[PDB]
Design an enzyme around this catalytic site. Structure first.
Site, PDB file in Angstrom:
ATOM      1  N   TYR A   1       0.839  -1.200   0.000  1.00  9.79           N
ATOM      2  CA  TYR A   1       0.000   0.000   0.000  1.00  9.79           C
ATOM      3  C   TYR A   1       0.877   1.254   0.000  1.00  9.79           C
ATOM      4  CZ  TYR A   1      -3.854   3.160   1.221  1.00  9.79           C
ATOM      5  OH  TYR A   1      -4.787   4.172   1.256  1.00  9.79           O
TER       6      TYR A   1
ATOM      7  N   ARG B   1      -0.942   7.956  -4.278  1.00 11.10           N
ATOM      8  CA  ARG B   1      -1.852   7.003  -3.661  1.00 11.10           C
ATOM      9  C   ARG B   1      -3.197   7.667  -3.385  1.00 11.10           C
ATOM     10  NH1 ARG B   1       0.428   4.683   1.844  1.00 11.10           N
ATOM     11  NH2 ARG B   1      -0.928   6.332   2.690  1.00 11.10           N
ATOM     12  N   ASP B   2      -4.255   6.856  -3.392  1.00  8.23           N
ATOM     13  CA  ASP B   2      -5.593   7.309  -3.004  1.00  8.23           C
ATOM     14  C   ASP B   2      -6.049   8.471  -3.884  1.00  8.23           C
ATOM     15  OD1 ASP B   2      -5.398   5.519  -0.617  1.00  8.23           O
ATOM     16  OD2 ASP B   2      -3.875   7.014  -0.065  1.00  8.23           O
TER      17      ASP B   2
ATOM     18  N   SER C   1      -3.985  12.403   0.641  1.00  8.05           N
ATOM     19  CA  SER C   1      -3.382  11.109   0.911  1.00  8.05           C
ATOM     20  C   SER C   1      -2.160  11.287   1.796  1.00  8.05           C
ATOM     21  CB  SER C   1      -2.981  10.406  -0.390  1.00  8.05           C
ATOM     22  OG  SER C   1      -2.261   9.216  -0.129  1.00  8.05           O
TER      23      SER C   1
ATOM     24  N   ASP D   1      -7.876  -0.038  -3.123  1.00  8.03           N
ATOM     25  CA  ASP D   1      -8.576   1.057  -3.797  1.00  8.03           C
ATOM     26  C   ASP D   1      -8.075   1.368  -5.202  1.00  8.03           C
ATOM     27  OD1 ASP D   1      -9.988   1.205  -1.460  1.00  8.03           O
ATOM     28  OD2 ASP D   1      -9.276   3.191  -0.893  1.00  8.03           O
TER      29      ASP D   1
ATOM     30  N   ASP E   1      -9.710   5.562  10.433  1.00 15.42           N
ATOM     31  CA  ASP E   1      -9.774   5.759   8.986  1.00 15.42           C
ATOM     32  C   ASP E   1      -9.436   7.178   8.559  1.00 15.42           C
ATOM     33  OD1 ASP E   1     -10.744   3.123   8.440  1.00 15.42           O
ATOM     34  OD2 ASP E   1     -12.774   3.787   8.957  1.00 15.42           O
TER      35      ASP E   1
END
Length: 358
Positions: free
Chosen positions: A83, A88-89, A95, A135, A313
């Protein structure tokens, strides 16, 4: 297939989650609830390699697992999440990822993979299962109109390919992240998703170590819902079993004998969301079905706990530069600390609302 990666193996228990849980349980005042909380440290979870700084810990986990197996006459299995994509994201508000496409992201990610491979290479008597990049591929199916995702597509594909190709060389069993029933399980999204996953599998050489897909990672869907959650209206695939039953044959038809793993770590309580897209610290969540290969489905190798319940989260503080407004919604437990940090009150409710009970 005939080879379920978990059969015949003892799962190495995360020392990091064990320490988080031990510290959490001593703060829980009711003795019985405290004992139930402490027992969560005996439930296997995935260790998130969300930065290069996590890699030394991976090395220790492999060596510890090797020694535990020799001591007990067992074969040990270490569970990891890859990850750390550049950019990312891509569909999120922000992120925490350390790499960017614009600053040598590809090369930096390859070096991250190389460091992971170099650790795994040293411990051939330990099995490793990896979830590949939560994701990312799902964002490339449904979020290509997000400009950050559109601009990240070639990098994501190259990086995921590099991870699959190189982790296969050290025999890692891999499940590509595949969203969840409310993301890719919509009937209209199944074929675009299958086409993408199959292309990724092909580019990485169709290695038998690429077992299939992971679903519901860090989410809250039922595996098998007693009745559809109202958030699912319009989607006949209202739980993970419907999603997997619908997607698996599309992969099989392409020549990929694909199997699945399903996160249930925060699925003990259904019907707690206002909208299916609400993902952040959903209030009232409970620990769900404990990891097991007794999945009830020919397509599912294991129920797993991928996201470690109790790790936040995302923050509800709108002043944070890592703030994502999904973390301030009504169905979101508040106030909430920064992502990844321990959220004690949330953990206590996960324990109290566990289903099956702890």
């Amino acid at each position: 297939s005939a080879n379920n990666p978990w059969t015949g193996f003892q799962i190495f228990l995360s020392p990091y989650y064990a320490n988080e849980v031990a510290a959490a349980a001593k703060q829980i005042t009711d003795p019985t609830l405290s004992s139930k909380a402490a027992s969560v440290a005996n439930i296997p979870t995935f260790t998130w390699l969300d930065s290069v700084a996590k890699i030394p810990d991976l090395g220790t986990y492999l060596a510890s697992a090797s020694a535990l197996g020799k001591s007990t006459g067992t074969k040990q299995l270490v569970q990891i999440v890859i990850y750390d994509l550049p950019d990312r994201d891509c569909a999120a508000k922000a992120s925490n990822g350390e790499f960017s496409i614009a600053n040598n992201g590809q090369a930096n990610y390859e070096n991250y993979i190389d460091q992971i491979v170099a650790q795994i290479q040293q411990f051939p008597d330990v099995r490793v299962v990896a979830v590949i990049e939560p994701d990312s591929l799902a964002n490339l199916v449904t979020n290509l109109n997000v400009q950050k995702c559109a601009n990240a597509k070639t990098t994501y594909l190259a990086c995921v390919n590099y991870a699959l190709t190189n982790l296969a060389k050290v025999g890692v069993y891999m499940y590509m992240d595949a969203g969840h029933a409310g993301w890719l399980g919509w009937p209209a999204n199944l074929s675009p998703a299958a086409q993408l996953f199959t292309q990724v599998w092909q580019n990485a050489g169709k290695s038998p170590f690429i077992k299939g897909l992971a679903t519901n990672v860090a989410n809250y869907n039922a595996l098998q819902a007693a009745s559809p959650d109202p958030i699912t209206q319009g989607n006949p695939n209202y739980d993970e079993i419907h999603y997997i039953n619908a997607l698996a044959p599309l992969l099989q038809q392409a020549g990929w004998d694909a199997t699945f793993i399903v996160d249930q770590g925060r699925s003990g309580v259904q019907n707690i969301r206002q909208q299916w897209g609400d993902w952040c610290n959903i209030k009232g969540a409970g620990f769900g079905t404990r990891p097991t290969t007794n999945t009830g489905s020919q397509f599912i190798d294991s129920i797993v706990w991928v996201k470690p319940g109790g790790e936040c989260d995302g923050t509800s503080n709108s002043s944070s530069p890592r703030y994502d407004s999904t973390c301030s919604l009504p169905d979101a437990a508040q106030p909430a600390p920064e992502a990844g940090t321990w959220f004690q009150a949330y953990f206590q409710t996960l324990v109290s609302a566990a289903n099956p009970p702890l």
